């Protein structure tokens, strides 16, 4: 209910190191719990071995689709979707974690990490944590993306959990 979360990242199977996130449990406890417990894999499934399937330079890294690995899947610890908890935290800076969705109250497991302020998403996507180590890895992954979001290397979460 409070430990920071890590992802180890590889790019075409080359380990690039660890990203660490602080989650905003005091602002969005239900959303933060979902991401943390998908990272620990405590329910038997989650982010370990998943990929970032859509990476757009000067915008964000999108991942978390551990069922279909293409944006059409993912599921939360509460079921296939759960409500938007609130929108109090805004997309003010690089390195923010926020939930991807398919309209109101369709949160599952997919998330993005911003590389710029994305204020136009305020009030529509729930922001729930921030990178505190490894923003350099985020920028390296970002460079493997493209305007369409297609990556030119496989970006994998090889391990994840709490620190």
């Amino acid at each position: 209910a409070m430990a920071n979360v890590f992802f180890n990242i590889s790019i075409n199977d080359k380990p690039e190191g660890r990203i660490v996130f602080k989650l905003y449990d005091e602002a969005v406890p239900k959303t933060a719990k979902n991401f943390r417990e998908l990272a620990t894999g405590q329910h038997g499934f989650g982010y370990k071995d998943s990929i970032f399937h859509r990476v757009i330079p000067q915008f964000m890294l999108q991942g978390g689709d551990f069922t279909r690995h293409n944006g059409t899947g993912g599921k939360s610890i509460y079921g296939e979707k759960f409500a938007d908890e609130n929108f109090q935290v805004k997309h003010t800076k690089p390195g923010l974690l926020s939930m991807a969705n398919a309209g109101a109250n369709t949160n599952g497991s997919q998330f993005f990490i911003t590389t710029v302020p994305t204020s136009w998403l305020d009030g529509k996507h729930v922001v729930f944590g921030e990178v505190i180590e490894g923003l350099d890895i985020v920028r390296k992954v970002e460079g493997k993306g493209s305007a369409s979001g297609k990556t030119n290397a496989t970006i994998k979460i090889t391990d994840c959990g709490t620190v």
């Binding site: 915008f59 964000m60 059409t72 398919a102 994305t118 998403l121």
Partner: peptide, 11 residues
């Protein structure tokens, strides 16, 4: 445009 959608990807 700049969107983060789960399956209907929009401009």
């Amino acid at each position: 445009x700049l969107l983060v959608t789960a399956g209907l990807v929009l401009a």
